[PDB]
Amino acid sequence: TRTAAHTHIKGLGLDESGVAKRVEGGFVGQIEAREACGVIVDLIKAKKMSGRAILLAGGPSTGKTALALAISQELGPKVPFCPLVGSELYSVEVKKTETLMENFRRAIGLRIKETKEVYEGEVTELTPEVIVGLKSAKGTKTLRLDPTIYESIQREKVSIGDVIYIEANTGAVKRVGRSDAYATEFDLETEEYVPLPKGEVHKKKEIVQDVTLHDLDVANARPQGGQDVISMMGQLLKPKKTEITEKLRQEVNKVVAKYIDQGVAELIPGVLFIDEVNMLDIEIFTYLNKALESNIAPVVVLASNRGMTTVRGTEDVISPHGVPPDLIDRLLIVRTLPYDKDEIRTIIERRATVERLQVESSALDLLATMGTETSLRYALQLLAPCGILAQTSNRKEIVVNDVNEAKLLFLDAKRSTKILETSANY
Amino acid sequence: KSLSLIAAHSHITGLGLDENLQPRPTSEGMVGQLQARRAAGVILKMVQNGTIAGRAVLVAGPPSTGKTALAMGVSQSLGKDVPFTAIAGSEIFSLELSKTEALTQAFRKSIGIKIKEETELIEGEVVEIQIDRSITGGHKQGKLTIKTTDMETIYELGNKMIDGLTKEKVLAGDVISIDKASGKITKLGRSFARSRDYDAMGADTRFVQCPEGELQKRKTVVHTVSLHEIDVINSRTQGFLALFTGDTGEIRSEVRDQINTKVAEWKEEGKAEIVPGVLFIDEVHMLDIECFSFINRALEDEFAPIVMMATNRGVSKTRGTNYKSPHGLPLDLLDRSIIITTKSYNEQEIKTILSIRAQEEEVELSSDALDLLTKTGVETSLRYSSNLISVAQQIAMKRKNNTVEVEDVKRAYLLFLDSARSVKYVQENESQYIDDQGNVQISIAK
Amino acid sequence: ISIDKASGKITKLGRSFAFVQCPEGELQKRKTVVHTVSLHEIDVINSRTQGFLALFTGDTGEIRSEVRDQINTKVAEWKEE
Amino acid sequence: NFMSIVNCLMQLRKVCNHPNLFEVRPILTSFVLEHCVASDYKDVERTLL
Ligand SMILES: Nc1ncnc2c1ncn2[C@@H]1O[C@H](COP(=O)(O)OP(=O)(O)O)[C@@H](O)[C@H]1O
Ligand SMILES: Nc1ncnc2c1ncn2[C@@H]1O[C@H](COP(=O)(O)OP(=O)(O)O)[C@@H](O)[C@H]1O
Ligand SMILES: [Mg+2]
Ligand SMILES: [Mg+2]
Ligand SMILES: [Mg+2]
């Protein structure tokens, strides 16, 4: 198996009153951040309001992204969490604002119940002008092919002895292959032998395939019928994402409104994520400043931490977290405190337990000392190297020799900087 | 319809004003700002007049002064039949339309035309659809018995409409809103006769809409379209694809000139109806000098819809130039346009607005929590308490009691910080987070 | 001559002469073959139709993340089973 | 009494009979929209043409 710095977190641990335990499901301290996250979790579970956002501010290794993954895994499978970084909004063929609205539209989940049927059977005859006489286990019916799907059928080399899985609603045709009934054609026949499908040819099912707002946007903006030749031209002339305007937005809103008022469907919100908004330019900040003043923009979370630094995209806007003053004035601050000696101890302990490292007491304490001396991450990155070193140096446990070898081998930023002021060359 | 659960801007429905163009202190949600609401009524009467063009007004002053509330109230108060363009100026940049093309598209969208077309109909229960062969003497003996509730009548198909009924596979008895210059017969479903059919038990499975109007009557159907649809039709033979997908492609000028002439003569011929709407733009201090010259010439042009342009910042840097002037705009356009200043609020109107928000959210508040919210809002800003009320309501559920008490607002205040709280917290942590140089002293000890 | 059953492909093991001796053993042999493919290749082959050209021409950019998530969960459950 | 023990035993003979596994694989199809947004505007386009 594989582990990448996470999957140790398995929930906030909020009790019936929303209060999380001290160290439970991969957590250490930060009761303020945990309580604020629980409050936001309850607000999202309400599923009534929208159009509100918060930022959580904390230094490196303060559990910001850890709390984001915790809330993500707490929400559950169906409700989606949208992770995105300021580098993502810089697209290529479309403008950044449209990308932000594509993310917003695909963020909201929309449970829907549409219908699909499939014709699947052994072909009995074809009549050009079109007949495809599909013969299932108990049914043998002859559809008509429109000229385009007739051409698709022609390209499918389907002949007497073939079964095709041609969908009814989309219309595209997927041949299943040579019929297993004609297995007595060649002892080494190349084509696979598939029998006549069960049921009638026009098999009908009730499906729960849902749709995100971007999904049904691309459904009509760039139709994807697929296997038919005309569908190939449709997906080839404009295969990319086109700049959907507000007119199609209103059309889509009407369509989703009528579908959700049909009764079976429903709506569920979602959470979007942004990291290091300090690098974001003033243009996107100004645009989102007027974009959150709407009725559809779902919940997004901000993770940033900067002091008295100029906001990127400007030259004189100095503000904390690299956020313009207006956004700060319209956004909710969550505080995070630096980790402590005992927090470092428990962090290294849990990170050893998840990594299947039975680190003993004194080794754990010394690793905590290094964590408290230079940085938490410097100590955390050494758990696997020290274990592997002790494995190569024939030690199940981690003696002080292993950690000293790691500290003289894998240096930190401070020691490298100490080296850097005494060098004949860079 | 129009799925939008709630918003901080979904609390105003239609504004409030009087025939005297005088403000209402509680004008359907938005309150105060007598000058702002009187000017809104003045502009409303201006646009109802439809006799002036090329006017630019600047909603100046400090931010948070109900500017967006004013725009929303105007939009909801003017009424239907007049589509607007309420888009912030930040997204003018695009990878498919240039700045000139985008500005031209906005200007041509702000001015609309309604079109009345004298289309026809053939309504009535078409109980049967007979399609006879193409006999030489009569090229189509196609019987089809369209009859409304008023009369019983038969008709005949001219070898062109047989597939018009069944472009999509439908049966007879369908109310057909047929158009002579369309070729696409629209079936409305099922329909009724006035007969009891046979003697034995029957007449089952018949409950639908029956034709009501006359067998034939002229319909002067009115359609409203913008210059975008007409221009994209001119540029390409097919225009619906670019209207939906959004890949028009920077249509050329002689198209706009010929559309200008065509619309002028259509208005002169009494077939079209001009609807000169008004454009709304935001963040004008952020606008750039080429846009400044564009609007400067547009104002002097004979055709220019009125402008709702506003700069939240005051005495800010003028984007696109090396100099800063008041409102972030140079004195040329500043003198060319007109100015309406907007000042901030006191506490009581914040209290009233928050009470309106609460009763819109149908939450049984307790006035102690409301007083706490008023104090928190007046200390910092309205939006602070506007979010605090919702989070305190969430805390009210979290403690299993419907009423919003003091402890809810207190927990909301202590959990989520304040701008002053955040700046104090960061200026005491000048060496704990990422800074200008990025120096983060993660080393708690030694 | 060696041919495959499910495809009938021809593979020239070599002419007998005019230079390989006639083979011994049994005619029909079975074996196993393992095929390797990278994550991005799986993402790009099944996302669209013309992506096969993108296997060499590289005529694609910013593949839709839905296909990426589907292939990721496919790989996860393949590894699980 | 004597016989209804065997009434439970009609389960004890299905435990030692045979167990099985699952080895299932997921596969999907494309869901469909067929209301369309074409026919509603083609007539208007042709009228204006
Ligand atoms: N409460 C916690 N419990 C367990 N591990 C944590 C906790 N907080 C942070 N970590 C670990 O510290 C690392 C940094 O945390 P993360 O939130 O991802 O970024 P940062 O905190 O630096 O913004 C993560 O890899 C995470 O595994
Ligand atoms: N006078 C008012 N009455 C009611 N709500 C208001 C008022 N002024 C502002 N708001 C609220 O504030 C939001 C708009 O902020 P606004 O004060 O217009 O900022 P700015 O003036 O900088 O545009 C709206 O969602 C609205 O609910
Ligand atoms: Mg973090
Ligand atoms: Mg505002
Ligand atoms: Mg001029």
Swiss-Prot record, chain A:
The keyword Nucleotide-binding applies. Keywords: Acetylation, Activator, ATP-binding, Chromatin regulator, DNA damage, DNA repair, Helicase, Hydrolase, Nucleotide-binding, Nucleus, Transcription, Transcription regulation. GO terms for molecular function: 5'-3' DNA helicase activity; ATP binding; ATP hydrolysis activity; DNA helicase activity. The keyword Hydrolase applies. One of its GO terms (cellular component) is Swr1 complex. Disulfide bonds: none annotated. It catalyses: ATP + H2O = ADP + phosphate + H(+). Probably forms a homohexamer. Interacts with RVB2 and may form heterododecamers with RVB2. Component of the SWR1 chromatin remodeling complex composed of at least ACT1, ARP4, RVB1, RVB2, ARP6, YAF9, VPS71, VPS72, SWC3, SWC4, SWC5, SWC7 and SWR1, and perhaps BDF1. Component of the chromatin-remodeling INO80 complex, at least composed of ARP4, ARP5, ARP8, RVB1, RVB2, TAF14, NHP10, IES1, IES3, IES4, IES6, ACT1, IES2, IES5 and INO80. Component of the R2TP complex composed of at least RVB1, RVB2, TAH1 and PIH1. Interacts with SPT15/TBP and HSP90. Belongs to the RuvB family. This is RuvB-like protein 1. It comes from Saccharomyces cerevisiae (strain ATCC 204508 / S288c) (Baker's yeast). The gene is RVB1.
From Swiss-Prot, chain B:
Changing residue 66 to A: Growth defect at 37 degrees Celsius. ATP binds at residues 61-68. Keywords: Activator, ATP-binding, Chromatin regulator, DNA damage, DNA repair, Helicase, Hydrolase, Nucleotide-binding, Nucleus, rRNA processing, Transcription, Transcription regulation. Belongs to the RuvB family. This is RuvB-like protein 2. The lineage of its organism: Eukaryota, Fungi, Dikarya, Ascomycota, Saccharomycotina. It comes from the Eukaryota. DNA helicase which participates in several chromatin remodeling complexes, including the SWR1 and the INO80 complexes. The SWR1 complex mediates the ATP-dependent exchange of histone H2A for the H2A variant HZT1 leading to transcriptional regulation of selected genes by chromatin remodeling. The INO80 complex remodels chromatin by shifting nucleosomes. Its ability to induce transcription of some phosphate-responsive genes is modulated by inositol polyphosphates. The INO80 complex is involved in DNA repair by associating to 'Ser-129' phosphorylated H2A histones as a response to DNA damage. Its EC number is 3.6.4.12. One of its GO terms (molecular function) is ATP binding. One of its GO terms (cellular component) is Ino80 complex. SMART domains: AAA. InterPro entries: AAA+_ATPase, P-loop_NTPase, RuvB-like, RuvB-like_C, RuvBL1/2_DNA/RNA_bd_dom, TIP49_P-loop. GO terms for biological process: box C/D snoRNP assembly; chromatin remodeling; DNA repair; protein stabilization; regulation of DNA-templated transcription; regulation of transcription by RNA polymerase II; rRNA processing.
Swiss-Prot record, chain C:
Probably forms a homohexamer. Interacts with RVB1 and may form heterododecamers with RVB1. Component of the SWR1 chromatin remodeling complex composed of at least ACT1, ARP4, RVB1, RVB2, ARP6, YAF9, VPS71, VPS72, SWC3, SWC4, SWC5, SWC7 and SWR1, and perhaps BDF1. Component of the chromatin-remodeling INO80 complex, at least composed of ARP4, ARP5, ARP8, RVB1, RVB2, TAF14, NHP10, IES1, IES3, IES4, IES6, ACT1, IES2, IES5 and INO80. Also belongs to the R2TP complex composed of at least RVB1, RVB2, TAH1 and PIH1. Interacts with SPT15/TBP. It comes from the Eukaryota. It is found in: Nucleus, Nucleoplasm. Belongs to the RuvB family. This is RuvB-like protein 2. It comes from Saccharomyces cerevisiae (strain ATCC 204508 / S288c). The chain holds residues 190 to 283 of 471 of the full protein. Present with 3030 molecules/cell in log phase SD medium.
From Swiss-Prot, chain D:
It comes from the Eukaryota. It is found in: Nucleus. Catalytic component of the SWR1 complex which mediates the ATP-dependent exchange of histone H2A for the H2A variant HZT1 leading to transcriptional regulation of selected genes by chromatin remodeling. Component of the SWR1 chromatin-remodeling complex composed of at least ACT1, ARP4, RVB1, RVB2, ARP6, YAF9, VPS71, VPS72, SWC3, SWC4, SWC5, SWC7 and SWR1, and perhaps BDF1. Belongs to the SNF2/RAD54 helicase family. SWR1 subfamily. Present with 656 molecules/cell in log phase SD medium. This is Helicase SWR1. The gene is SWR1.
